[PDB]
Tab-separated table of all heavy atoms in Angstrom:
chain	number	residue	atom	x	y	z
A	1	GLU	N	4.745	24.206	-7.898
A	1	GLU	CA	5.001	25.609	-7.593
A	1	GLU	C	6.010	26.207	-8.559
A	1	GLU	O	5.831	27.331	-9.035
A	1	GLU	CB	5.503	25.756	-6.161
A	1	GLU	CG	4.429	25.732	-5.115
A	1	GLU	CD	4.997	25.576	-3.727
A	1	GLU	OE1	6.214	25.783	-3.562
A	1	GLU	OE2	4.235	25.242	-2.801
A	2	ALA	N	7.087	25.478	-8.851
A	2	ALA	CA	8.092	25.993	-9.773
A	2	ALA	C	7.522	26.152	-11.174
A	2	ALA	O	7.824	27.126	-11.869
A	2	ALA	CB	9.310	25.073	-9.790
A	3	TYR	N	6.708	25.195	-11.614
A	3	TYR	CA	6.075	25.314	-12.922
A	3	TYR	C	5.146	26.518	-12.973
A	3	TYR	O	5.097	27.231	-13.979
A	3	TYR	CB	5.300	24.040	-13.245
A	3	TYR	CG	6.079	22.990	-14.003
A	3	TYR	CD1	6.255	21.724	-13.477
A	3	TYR	CD2	6.618	23.259	-15.251
A	3	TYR	CE1	6.953	20.761	-14.160
A	3	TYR	CE2	7.314	22.303	-15.941
A	3	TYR	CZ	7.480	21.055	-15.391
A	3	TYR	OH	8.170	20.096	-16.078
A	4	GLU	N	4.391	26.754	-11.900
A	4	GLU	CA	3.430	27.849	-11.897
A	4	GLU	C	4.099	29.205	-11.756
A	4	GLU	O	3.480	30.223	-12.080
A	4	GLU	CB	2.413	27.655	-10.775
A	4	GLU	CG	1.272	26.730	-11.143
A	4	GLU	CD	0.460	26.289	-9.940
A	4	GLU	OE1	1.050	26.089	-8.858
A	4	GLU	OE2	-0.772	26.144	-10.076
A	5	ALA	N	5.342	29.246	-11.290
A	5	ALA	CA	6.071	30.490	-11.121
A	5	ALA	C	7.032	30.772	-12.265
A	5	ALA	O	7.818	31.715	-12.174
A	5	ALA	CB	6.841	30.465	-9.802
A	6	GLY	N	7.002	29.972	-13.325
A	6	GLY	CA	7.891	30.161	-14.446
A	6	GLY	C	9.307	29.695	-14.213
A	6	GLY	O	10.149	29.861	-15.101
A	7	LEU	N	9.598	29.105	-13.056
A	7	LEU	CA	10.973	28.739	-12.746
A	7	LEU	C	11.432	27.540	-13.562
A	7	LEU	O	12.623	27.409	-13.846
A	7	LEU	CB	11.107	28.462	-11.252
A	7	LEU	CG	10.648	29.609	-10.351
A	7	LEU	CD1	10.539	29.158	-8.912
A	7	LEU	CD2	11.595	30.775	-10.472
A	8	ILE	N	10.514	26.657	-13.941
A	8	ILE	CA	10.817	25.525	-14.804
A	8	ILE	C	9.728	25.429	-15.864
A	8	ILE	O	8.686	26.078	-15.780
A	8	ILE	CB	10.935	24.196	-14.029
A	8	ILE	CG1	9.690	23.949	-13.184
A	8	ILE	CG2	12.168	24.204	-13.155
A	8	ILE	CD1	9.693	22.625	-12.490
A	9	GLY	N	9.987	24.606	-16.870
A	9	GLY	CA	9.057	24.444	-17.965
A	9	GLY	C	9.537	25.170	-19.198
A	9	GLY	O	10.741	25.232	-19.454
A	10	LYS	N	8.613	25.719	-19.975
A	10	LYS	CA	9.005	26.526	-21.117
A	10	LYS	C	9.664	27.809	-20.635
A	10	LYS	O	9.170	28.459	-19.710
A	10	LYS	CB	7.796	26.856	-21.983
A	10	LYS	CG	8.153	27.695	-23.189
A	10	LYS	CD	7.033	27.747	-24.195
A	10	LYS	CE	7.434	27.056	-25.486
A	10	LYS	NZ	8.621	27.679	-26.128
A	11	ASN	N	10.772	28.180	-21.270
A	11	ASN	CA	11.462	29.428	-20.967
A	11	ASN	C	11.644	29.575	-19.458
A	11	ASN	O	11.170	30.519	-18.827
A	11	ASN	CB	10.695	30.609	-21.562
A	11	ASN	CG	11.363	31.934	-21.301
A	11	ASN	OD1	12.519	32.140	-21.655
A	11	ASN	ND2	10.631	32.850	-20.689
A	12	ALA	N	12.329	28.593	-18.882
A	12	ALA	CA	12.497	28.537	-17.439
A	12	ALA	C	13.234	29.768	-16.933
A	12	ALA	O	14.254	30.170	-17.495
A	12	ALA	CB	13.259	27.273	-17.051
A	13	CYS	N	12.711	30.364	-15.863
A	13	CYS	CA	13.318	31.521	-15.209
A	13	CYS	C	13.507	32.693	-16.163
A	13	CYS	O	14.268	33.616	-15.867
A	13	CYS	CB	14.662	31.152	-14.569
A	13	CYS	SG	14.530	30.225	-13.030
A	14	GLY	N	12.830	32.681	-17.305
A	14	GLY	CA	13.051	33.690	-18.319
A	14	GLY	C	14.315	33.508	-19.123
A	14	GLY	O	14.675	34.405	-19.889
A	15	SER	N	14.999	32.375	-18.982
A	15	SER	CA	16.291	32.171	-19.621
A	15	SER	C	16.188	31.764	-21.082
A	15	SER	O	17.211	31.752	-21.771
A	15	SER	CB	17.075	31.096	-18.874
A	15	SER	OG	16.728	29.808	-19.353
A	16	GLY	N	15.001	31.427	-21.571
A	16	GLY	CA	14.886	30.884	-22.906
A	16	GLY	C	15.261	29.427	-23.019
A	16	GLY	O	15.457	28.939	-24.136
A	17	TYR	N	15.368	28.719	-21.900
A	17	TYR	CA	15.723	27.309	-21.866
A	17	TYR	C	14.517	26.521	-21.382
A	17	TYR	O	13.856	26.923	-20.422
A	17	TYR	CB	16.921	27.078	-20.945
A	17	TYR	CG	17.565	25.718	-21.069
A	17	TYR	CD1	18.372	25.407	-22.151
A	17	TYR	CD2	17.380	24.750	-20.094
A	17	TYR	CE1	18.965	24.171	-22.262
A	17	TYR	CE2	17.968	23.512	-20.199
A	17	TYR	CZ	18.761	23.229	-21.282
A	17	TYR	OH	19.350	21.996	-21.390
A	18	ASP	N	14.224	25.416	-22.052
A	18	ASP	CA	13.078	24.582	-21.722
A	18	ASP	C	13.539	23.408	-20.873
A	18	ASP	O	14.459	22.683	-21.261
A	18	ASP	CB	12.389	24.080	-22.989
A	18	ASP	CG	12.134	25.184	-23.991
A	18	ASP	OD1	11.630	26.249	-23.590
A	18	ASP	OD2	12.440	24.987	-25.183
A	19	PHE	N	12.903	23.225	-19.722
A	19	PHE	CA	13.280	22.152	-18.818
A	19	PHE	C	12.043	21.601	-18.131
A	19	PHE	O	11.180	22.359	-17.687
A	19	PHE	CB	14.288	22.637	-17.775
A	19	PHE	CG	15.128	21.545	-17.198
A	19	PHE	CD1	16.069	20.901	-17.970
A	19	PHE	CD2	14.976	21.158	-15.883
A	19	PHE	CE1	16.835	19.896	-17.445
A	19	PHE	CE2	15.748	20.151	-15.356
A	19	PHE	CZ	16.674	19.523	-16.137
A	20	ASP	N	11.970	20.277	-18.046
A	20	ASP	CA	10.908	19.584	-17.338
A	20	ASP	C	11.510	18.761	-16.212
A	20	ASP	O	12.611	18.227	-16.341
A	20	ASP	CB	10.121	18.668	-18.271
A	20	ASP	CG	9.235	19.427	-19.211
A	20	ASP	OD1	8.524	20.342	-18.756
A	20	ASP	OD2	9.252	19.116	-20.414
A	21	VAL	N	10.786	18.665	-15.104
A	21	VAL	CA	11.198	17.852	-13.966
A	21	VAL	C	10.123	16.801	-13.739
A	21	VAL	O	9.005	17.124	-13.322
A	21	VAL	CB	11.429	18.699	-12.711
A	21	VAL	CG1	11.976	17.845	-11.585
A	21	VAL	CG2	12.384	19.826	-13.015
A	22	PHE	N	10.460	15.543	-14.005
A	22	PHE	CA	9.557	14.418	-13.830
A	22	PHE	C	9.975	13.621	-12.607
A	22	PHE	O	11.166	13.405	-12.378
A	22	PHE	CB	9.569	13.495	-15.050
A	22	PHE	CG	9.118	14.148	-16.317
A	22	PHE	CD1	10.026	14.471	-17.303
A	22	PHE	CD2	7.784	14.422	-16.531
A	22	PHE	CE1	9.613	15.061	-18.466
A	22	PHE	CE2	7.370	15.017	-17.697
A	22	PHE	CZ	8.282	15.334	-18.662
A	23	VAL	N	8.995	13.177	-11.828
A	23	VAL	CA	9.229	12.315	-10.679
A	23	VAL	C	8.666	10.939	-10.992
A	23	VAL	O	7.491	10.807	-11.349
A	23	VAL	CB	8.596	12.892	-9.402
A	23	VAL	CG1	8.814	11.953	-8.235
A	23	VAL	CG2	9.178	14.247	-9.101
A	24	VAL	N	9.505	9.919	-10.866
A	24	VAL	CA	9.111	8.536	-11.080
A	24	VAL	C	9.474	7.749	-9.833
A	24	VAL	O	10.587	7.883	-9.316
A	24	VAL	CB	9.786	7.936	-12.326
A	24	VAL	CG1	9.326	8.670	-13.570
A	24	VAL	CG2	11.290	7.999	-12.206
A	25	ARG	N	8.541	6.944	-9.346
A	25	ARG	CA	8.697	6.234	-8.086
A	25	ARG	C	9.187	4.811	-8.318
A	25	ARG	O	8.816	4.165	-9.300
A	25	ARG	CB	7.376	6.211	-7.320
A	25	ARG	CG	6.818	7.589	-7.038
A	25	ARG	CD	5.508	7.539	-6.288
A	25	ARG	NE	5.551	6.625	-5.152
A	25	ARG	CZ	4.973	5.428	-5.111
A	25	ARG	NH1	4.284	4.962	-6.140
A	25	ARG	NH2	5.089	4.689	-4.025
A	26	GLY	N	10.033	4.334	-7.412
A	26	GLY	CA	10.456	2.955	-7.417
A	26	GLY	C	9.398	2.051	-6.825
A	26	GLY	O	8.353	2.486	-6.346
A	27	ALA	N	9.684	0.751	-6.856
A	27	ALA	CA	8.728	-0.247	-6.398
A	27	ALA	C	9.343	-1.229	-5.410
A	27	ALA	O	8.832	-2.336	-5.252
A	27	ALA	CB	8.138	-1.001	-7.589
A	28	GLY	N	10.425	-0.854	-4.741
A	28	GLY	CA	11.018	-1.722	-3.744
A	28	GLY	C	12.196	-2.511	-4.268
A	28	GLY	O	12.042	-3.651	-4.707
A	29	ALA	N	13.379	-1.911	-4.221
A	29	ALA	CA	14.589	-2.560	-4.701
A	29	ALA	C	15.792	-1.676	-4.420
A	29	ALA	O	15.924	-0.596	-4.997
A	29	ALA	CB	14.497	-2.859	-6.197
A	30	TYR	N	16.671	-2.128	-3.532
A	30	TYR	CA	17.883	-1.377	-3.248
A	30	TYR	C	18.805	-1.332	-4.456
A	30	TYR	O	19.567	-0.376	-4.613
A	30	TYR	CB	18.594	-1.994	-2.045
A	30	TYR	CG	20.057	-1.659	-1.919
A	30	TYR	CD1	20.466	-0.403	-1.521
A	30	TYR	CD2	21.029	-2.609	-2.179
A	30	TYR	CE1	21.794	-0.096	-1.396
A	30	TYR	CE2	22.359	-2.313	-2.054
A	30	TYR	CZ	22.738	-1.053	-1.661
A	30	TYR	OH	24.071	-0.750	-1.536
A	31	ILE	N	18.743	-2.344	-5.325
A	31	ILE	CA	19.611	-2.370	-6.492
A	31	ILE	C	19.267	-1.255	-7.461
A	31	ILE	O	20.121	-0.836	-8.243
A	31	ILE	CB	19.549	-3.732	-7.211
A	31	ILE	CG1	20.536	-3.776	-8.377
A	31	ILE	CG2	18.159	-4.008	-7.738
A	31	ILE	CD1	21.934	-3.342	-8.035
A	32	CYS	N	18.044	-0.747	-7.424
A	32	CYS	CA	17.665	0.303	-8.355
A	32	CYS	C	18.307	1.637	-8.034
A	32	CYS	O	18.075	2.598	-8.767
A	32	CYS	CB	16.147	0.445	-8.389
A	32	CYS	SG	15.381	-0.705	-9.526
A	33	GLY	N	19.094	1.730	-6.963
A	33	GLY	CA	19.932	2.894	-6.764
A	33	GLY	C	21.199	2.886	-7.585
A	33	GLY	O	21.772	3.950	-7.822
A	34	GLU	N	21.653	1.714	-8.021
A	34	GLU	CA	22.790	1.649	-8.926
A	34	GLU	C	22.435	2.351	-10.228
A	34	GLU	O	21.321	2.219	-10.735
A	34	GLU	CB	23.177	0.192	-9.183
A	34	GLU	CG	24.605	-0.010	-9.643
A	34	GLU	CD	24.777	0.137	-11.142
A	34	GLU	OE1	23.779	0.025	-11.875
A	34	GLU	OE2	25.910	0.362	-11.593
A	35	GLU	N	23.388	3.107	-10.773
A	35	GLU	CA	23.036	4.081	-11.802
A	35	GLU	C	22.405	3.421	-13.021
A	35	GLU	O	21.401	3.914	-13.544
A	35	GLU	CB	24.261	4.897	-12.210
A	35	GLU	CG	25.498	4.102	-12.498
A	35	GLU	CD	26.558	4.930	-13.190
A	35	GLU	OE1	26.569	6.161	-12.995
A	35	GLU	OE2	27.377	4.356	-13.936
């Protein structure tokens, strides 16, 4: 929805700033919360 509304991606929110939001899933590990 944000990508389709111009809020993120190329020229996000009309600001002239390029931003992508990627989601990557874990596979079962509490240790993977450590930075």
